[PDB]
Structures are given as structure tokens and as C-alpha cells.
């Protein structure tokens, strides 16, 4: 039985643990945090995530999709809130097959941990990786007190998130060629209670967005009709725009309330605990990190956020990490040796990681005239050639097309629409048959 040590019992690490353990690998998984399945008197955790077809399919292959979806809220469309216009519900597709799922992160992690243990993995909590000695094949772990314990390893999977210690250890024995692109937005998680969301008729089966240019809020539903709201706002006001809002201007929760009342007036009344959430929840940081290599020989590999931190604006980070886990287990299972597997994994996944990293950054702008007309012509082309003209968002979210192919086809589509609408003011002026022939010329089924 082949041996593997996984660092991080998050989303990627627990899935890859299950996939390898059920294929007969001897799997030990090490997690810095306590076991979330051991109920304590601590406050619950209400962060949720959008699960799309890529993540769902990964869970399906692992036999866990049914259990996860039973605890998830269907989101049938995007609900865009702008003051002065009623909320506009933009359906994701023609029917409920094209939806995304709002799942509580803690509940998803618990289901995955059970799945990993059911397949035979051993999971060891309260042990955080501190360092790796690659030449001696040993690693050093410790609890929160820092009491150190050493373990031998044969294959090390770094599934330990965007601040990966495995990545830090690798960067010392190989040049990972890291390129860090900091994101100026921080984020803050806020809460809408079930009573408030019902009082204001907030639609439960939708993803909600309050755009406001350089900042915005999103809200995702929970099973009990509460919503988790996330504010995205610059950490600092730019020099050469020092008045603009930023976390630095919001000195306390009362300042945050004044900010919401002015900039997000239909949302502020739903946020009963704004002042306390704002002061008690930490401001998060965002970034894009691109690595030239993801592995050290056959000894260690990164996946998930450890390999490709991305901005969250496409809701694909977890979905990508679960897709990584499937791919890594597949390569390891069937390769000639571990070094071959890890090289092949990296070669397969790196172009797609770059693509979603880029599309996630682009997606922020797109959710921040000419646009209507292009989107209108695109809807017609999707009706005439539904196997050829598929909106990029739909390729990313509702299909398993490799992200880089989705991005390439999306650019062909966006250029074709922009050129077709240029020098036209309405659609009856446009030759739909000529556009369709360009679709069938440039977009294979």
C-alpha cells in the first residue's frame, strides 16, 4: 500500500484523502485546527460558499454529492440591487439544472472529514506543519503551544491553504518562481437574520449583489433563511482620491453603520448586528499568487489555494480546489511513479489555474447601451447554436470544460459580439445570419 501524508484537512485535502484512501493508499492527514466535529460551547460559524458544477462533479465522483446538496440552498439566479430600481433577478439558465448551491463551509468540511475517515484515512488534528526537511524526509509539526513532533514522510501533499506552510518549505529547496499580485480590497462578513430577510422579502433562492463600483456587497442564503453578507472594500483610501471609502475610514462599527446607511440604504435595515459584526469579525485579505512550479520531485506537491490563491469574485476557488483533488488522485493512482504523477498533474492543472485566476479578476469589473445590445445578441446566438455559443460565465459555472478552453472560447464570443454590435444602435439593424455563420466558423460544437 502506497503511503501519503496530507497537510490541511480543508476542502482539497479531505477530498484527496478520501479518493486515495478508497484506492488503498495509507493516508495520514494533519490539520492545525481542532476537529470541527467535536462539538464545543463555542459560537457557530456561518460562512457559506457557492458550489458549482465543477465542485459538484468532484463530490459526485467521491460519492458525497447527495449528502452535501441535502444541506444546500439552490440559487437560481443573480439578484442585483441598485437603489431606485426593484431587484432584477437574472436567471442563470432556462431551468433548475443550471443553478449554483449555497453551502455552509463548516458543514461541507464536516461531511468531507467523515468521508475521508469512512474511506480509511487517519486524520490528526491540532497539529500544524512548521517545517519540512526534504533531504531527510521528515517534517515537523506542533500544536498551538509549539510543542514539536517529527514525522517521516514519503509523499507530502500541501493542501494547507493560501498561506501554505508546505509552500513555504518548498520555496527553500526549489525556486517556485512566485509572483504575488496583491488585491486592494479587504472583506468583512456580516449577517442577516431569518426574521429580517423575511421582513424585507429577500429572495432565498438567489445570490444577491449590491454593486457600488470600487466596493460591493454580496449575500448568500442559508437553510434557515438567514444570509451571510460579505462587504468588499479597499483597505486604504488611495493617495489621489483620499476621500473615497475604505476600511481605514471606518474607525468603528458606528462609522460602518453610517457608511451602510448612505451607500447601501436598502441593505442597512437588514443588518441588525452590523456594528458588532464589523468590530468583532476580522477584515480579510485577498491576493492572486502564481507559481512557476507546484512540486518538488516526487516528494511534495501543492494543490488548491496552496498552489494558486485567487481573488474570490468568480466563486470558483473551492470548485477549482475540488477539481484539483480529483486530478491529483487520478494522476497518483495510475502513474509509473510519484515524480511522474506530480509533473503530469502540474502540467495539466497549471494552465487552467492561470485561466480562472485571470477570469476571477475580470469578473470583479464585469460586476461593478453597448452592453445590453451585446448581451441581447448573445442570447439570440445561444438560441440558434446552443452547442457552440455558450456564455463564458456558463462555461465556467455549469460545465467542466477546462478553464483555459472556457476563457479562449469566451474571448472569441466577446470579440464577435463587440464587433457585430459596433456601428449599430439596435438589433434589427444586425444581420443575424452573418453572426451565426461566424459562430459556426469560429466555435466548434
Ligand X SMILES: Cc1cc2nc3c(=O)[nH]c(=O)nc-3n(C[C@H](O)[C@H](O)[C@H](O)COP(=O)(O)OP(=O)(O)OC[C@H]3O[C@@H](n4cnc5c(N)ncnc54)[C@H](O)[C@@H]3O)c2cc1C
Ligand Y SMILES: O=C(O)c1ccc(-c2cccc(Cl)c2Cl)o1
Residue 319 partner contact from Ca ion, ligand X, ligand Y, none using kind-dependent CB cut-offs of 5 to 8 Å: ligand X
- Cα(355)–Cα(290) distance, integer angstroms: 11
Where do the H-state alpha helices sit in 23-104? 53-61, 65-69
Which letter does DSSP use for residue 285 in this model?
A: -
The contact set with ligand Y (CB under 6 A) reads 50, 78, 100, 207, 209, 218, 312-313, 315, 367
In whole angstroms, how close is the CB of 140 to Ca ion at the nearest point? 9
Nearer to ligand X, 17 or 377 (CB): 17
Structure-block grid coordinates of residue 258? 453610517
Angle between helices 432-442 and 370-384 (to 10 degrees): 70
- Work out how close the CB of 62 gets to ligand X at its nearest, in angstroms, rounded to a whole number: 14
To the question of whether residue 152 is assigned a binding role by annotation, the answer is no
Instruction: Tell me which residues touch Ca ion (CB under 5 A).
Output: 128, 142
Q: How far is the CB of 440 from ligand Y (least distance, A)?
A: 29
Least distance CB 189 / ligand X (angstroms)? 7
CB 378 within 8 A of CB 417: yes
Of 216 and 325, CB closest to ligand Y: 216
Length of the chain: 445
Q: Which is nearer to ligand X, 106 or 330 (CB)?
A: 106
Question: CA-CA-CA-CA torsion for 168, 54, 358, 444, nearest 10 degrees?
Answer: 140
Q: Round to whole Å and give the CA distance between 126 and 131.
A: 16
Strands 26-30 and 77-82: unpaired
User: Which does residue 11 touch among Ca ion, ligand Y, ligand X, none (CB within 5 to 8 A, set by kind)?
Assistant: ligand X
12 is in an annotated binding site: yes
Binding site for ligand X (CB under 6 A): 7-13, 30-33, 49-50, 128-129, 159-161, 165, 187, 230, 284, 304-306, 312, 315-319, 321
Contact partner at residue 78 from ligand X, ligand Y, Ca ion, none, CB < 5 to 8 Å by partner kind: ligand Y
- Strand (E) or helix (H) holding 256: helix 253-263
DSSP for residue 422: T
Cβ-Cβ contacts under 8 Å for 238 (sequence gap 6 or more): 244
Please report where in the chains the cell 493512482 appears, as a residue.
333
CB nearer to ligand X: give 10 or 378: 10
Smallest separation, CB 317 to Ca ion (Å): 25
The residue among 409, 404, 435 whose CA lies nearest residue 422 is: 435
C-alpha span between 93 and 88 (Å, rounded) = 15
170 is in an annotated binding site: no
277 is in an annotated binding site: no
The CB-of-305 to Ca ion minimum distance in angstroms stands at 19
List the binding residues for FAD: 11-12, 31-33, 50, 105, 129, 305, 318-319
List the binding residues for L-kynurenine: 78, 92, 363, 393
List the binding residues: 11-12, 31-33, 50, 78, 92, 105, 129, 305, 318-319, 363, 393
Amino acid at each position: 500500500a502506497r503511503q501519503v501524508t496530507i497537510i490541511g484537512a480543508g476542502l482539497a485535502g479531505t477530498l484527496v484523502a478520501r479518493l486515495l484512501a478508497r484506492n488503498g493508499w495509507q493516508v495520514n492527514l494533519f490539520e492545525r485546527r481542532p476537529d470541527p466535529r467535536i462539538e464545543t460551547g463555542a459560537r457557530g460559524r456561518s460562512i457559506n460558499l457557492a458550489l458549482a458544477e465543477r465542485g459538484a462533479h468532484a463530490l459526485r465522483l467521491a460519492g458525497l454529492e447527495r449528502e452535501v446538496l441535502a444541506e444546500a440552498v439552490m440559487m437560481r439566479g443573480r439578484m442585483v440591487h441598485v437603489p431606485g430600481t426593484p431587484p432584477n433577478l437574472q436567471p442563470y439558465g432556462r431551468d433548475d439544472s443550471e443553478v449554483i448551491w449555497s453551502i455552509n463551509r463548516d458543514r461541507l468540511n464536516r461531511i468531507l472529514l467523515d468521508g475521508a475517515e469512512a474511506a480509511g484515512a487517519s486524520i490528526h488534528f491540532n497539529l500544524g506543519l512548521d517545517s519540512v526537511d526534504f533531504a531527510r524526509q521528515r517534517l515537523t509539526l506542533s500544536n498551538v503551544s509549539g510543542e514539536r513532533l517529527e514525522k517521516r514522510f514519503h509523499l507530502l501533499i500541501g493542501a494547507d491553504g493560501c498561506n501554505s506552510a508546505v509552500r513555504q518549505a518548498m520555496a527553500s529547496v526549489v525556486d517556485l518562481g512566485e509572483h504575488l499580485e496583491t488585491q486592494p480590497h479587504g472583506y468583512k462578513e456580516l449577517q442577516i437574520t431569518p426574521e429580517a430577510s423575511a421582513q424585507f422579502n429577500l429572495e432565498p433562492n438567489a445570490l444577491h449583489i449590491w454593486p457600488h463600483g470600487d466596493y460591493m456587497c454580496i449575500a448568500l442564503p442559508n437553510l434557515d433563511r438567514s444570509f451571510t453578507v460579505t462587504l468588499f472594500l479597499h483597505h486604504q483610501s488611495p493617495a489621489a482620491q483620499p476621500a473615497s471609502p475604505s476600511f481605514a475610514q471606518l474607525v468603528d462599527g458606528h462609522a460602518a453603520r453610517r457608511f451602510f446607511q448612505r451607500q447601501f440604504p436598502d441593505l442597512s435595515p437588514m443588518l441588525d448586528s452590523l456594528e458588532q459584526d464589523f468590530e468583532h469579525h476580522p477584515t480579510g485579505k485577498l491576493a492572486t499568487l502564481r507559481l512557476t512550479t507546484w512540486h518538488v520531485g516526487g516528494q511534495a506537491v501543492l494543490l488548491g489555494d496552496a498552489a494558486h490563491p485567487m481573488v474570490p469574485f468568480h466563486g470558483q476557488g473551492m470548485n477549482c480546489a475540488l477539481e484539483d483533488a480529483v486530478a491529483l488522485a487520478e494522476h497518483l493512482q495510475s502513474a509509473a511513479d510519484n515524480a511522474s504523477a506530480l509533473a503530469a498533474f502540474t502540467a495539466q492543472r497549471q494552465p487552467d489555474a492561470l485561466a480562472i485566476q485571470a477570469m476571477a479578476l475580470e469578473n470583479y469589473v464585469e460586476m461593478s447601451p453597448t452592453y445590453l445590445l451585446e448581451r441581447e445578441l448573445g442570447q439570440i446566438m445561444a438560441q440558434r447554436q446552443p452547442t457552440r455559443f455558450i456564455p463564458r460565465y456558463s462555461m465556467v459555472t455549469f460545465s467542466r470544460l477546462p478553464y483555459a478552453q472556457a476563457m479562449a472560447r469566451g474571448q472569441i464570443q466577446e470579440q464577435l459580439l463587440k464587433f457585430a454590435v459596433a456601428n449599430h444602435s439596435d438589433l434589427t439593424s444586425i444581420n443575424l445570419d452573418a453572426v451565426e455563420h461566424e459562430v459556426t466558423r469560429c466555435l466548434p460544437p
